[PDB]
């Protein structure tokens, strides 16, 4: 039933949800597929065997956190069954598959297969009344109010630049990359072994991400600060164990600008966006210098955009006024943009009816997705 549609703020590392019109999603949670690895000895033990939410956010010492959205791209549809299965909990929903329209999101430059299998799920297993799935960049622009703008959006194993002028069909100019913080955090586990911290669990990885968002910043000087003596910021566990950092906190995101540090040829966020600029036009380029939509929680760092400003200043020519737009909610900008877009009346054609997909197939929606 076409009631207030469920605006699902997806995400590689953080896939959460809420509704349309609202400005606060009631179901905020990341991407995590965990399950206990022990045997219930004493009866009365808390169970469910697939822990998500407070269970997973409570029983971290027992779960094998899995991830289908590898680089945002789903690789396990069964994990998706469990993901929505937990999502479909009424304590997680308070609804059914049909009680509200669904608004799911995407990332650019993805295969059809994803939309296909997902349509099967939510229109056959689940039975969603109306739904359309598309890039989060558009929703971010909705939240900015802008129409012409390069959406620099980053997941957690995803980092990408989306050049947009009033939401036009520019997939050749529009770029996308799938590499970020998951891998950076894994490289921080490499840092751990180099430091001597013997850790190899996904629960430990969560803590590394807590440091990533917490005890990890950026600088602007790579080699200079590399030569500069650090302080080795001692992090403290929930246990409180001393964990020095050093300059590794900003050394690991240098890889986001220097992709070969992990052994992956690319050109860095900046140059890739510059390539997206190259595909645009000189006049429109100046607008896009002024129209920079940085987004993604992964982009939250000390002088992140300021360092990147210096980078592009070394890249872009003279008399080029570069202007960045990056709210503090570089996550919910997509959620609120979907909250607005989902709250439209013209949106009828924008969504896809249930029976429509049930008639012929997802290729019709693939026509609708472009």
């Amino acid at each position: 039933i076409a009631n207030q549609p469920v605006v699902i703020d997806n995400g590689s590392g953080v896939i959460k949800a809420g509704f349309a019109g609202d400005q606060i999603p009631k179901y905020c949670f990341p991407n995590y597929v965990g399950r206990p690895k022990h045997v219930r000895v004493m009866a009365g033990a808390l169970e469910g065997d697939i822990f998500i939410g407070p269970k997973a956010e409570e029983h971290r010492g027992l779960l094998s956190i899995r991830y289908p959205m590898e680089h945002g791209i789903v690789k396990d549809w069964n994990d998706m069954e469990r993901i929505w299965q937990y999502v479909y909990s009424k304590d997680q929903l308070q609804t059914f598959s049909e009680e509200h329209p669904v608004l799911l999101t995407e990332a650019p430059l993805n295969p059809r297969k994803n939309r296909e299998r997902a349509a099967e799920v939510f229109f056959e297993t689940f039975n969603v009344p109306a739904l359309f799935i598309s890039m989060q960049a558009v929703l971010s622009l909705y939240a900015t109010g802008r129409t012409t703008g390069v959406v620099l959006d980053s997941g957690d194993g995803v980092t990408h630049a989306v050049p947009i002028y009033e939401g036009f069909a520019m997939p050749h100019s529009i770029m996308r990359i799938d590499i970020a913080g998951r891998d950076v955090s894994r490289f921080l586990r490499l840092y751990l072994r180099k430091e001597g911290y013997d850790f190899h669990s996904s629960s430990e990885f969560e803590i590394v991400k807590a440091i990533k968002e917490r005890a990890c910043y950026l600088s602007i000087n790579p080699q200079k600060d590399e030569t500069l003596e650090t302080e080795k910021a001692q992090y403290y566990l929930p246990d409180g164990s001393t964990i020095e950092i050093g300059p590794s906190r900003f050394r690991a995101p240098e890889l986001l600008f220097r992709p070969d540090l992990i052994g992956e040829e690319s050109e860095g966020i900046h140059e890739v966006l510059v390539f997206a600029i190259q595909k645009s036009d000189m006049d429109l380029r100046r607008t896009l210098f002024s129209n920079i939509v940085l987004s993604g929680g992964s982009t939250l760092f000390k002088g992140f955009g300021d360092r990147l400003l210096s980078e592009v200043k070394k890249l872009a020519p003279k008399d080029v006024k570069i202007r960045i737009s990056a709210p503090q909610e570089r996550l919910y900008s997509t959620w609120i943009g979907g909250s607005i877009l989902a709250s439209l009346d013209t949106f009828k054609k924008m969504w896809v009816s249930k029976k429509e997909y049930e008639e012929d197939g997802a290729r019709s929606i693939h026509r609708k997705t472009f």
């Binding site: 606060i24 939250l300 400003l309 202007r323």
Partner: peptide, 24 residues
């Protein structure tokens, strides 16, 4: 700002707009 308080993963003390030192 109130919505910036409502959700946890939101940091502050950084201007949302970063521009170049456009030398007049």
């Amino acid at each position: 700002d109130p919505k910036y308080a409502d959700l946890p993963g939101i940091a502050r003390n950084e201007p949302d707009v970063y521009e170049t030192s456009d030398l007049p």
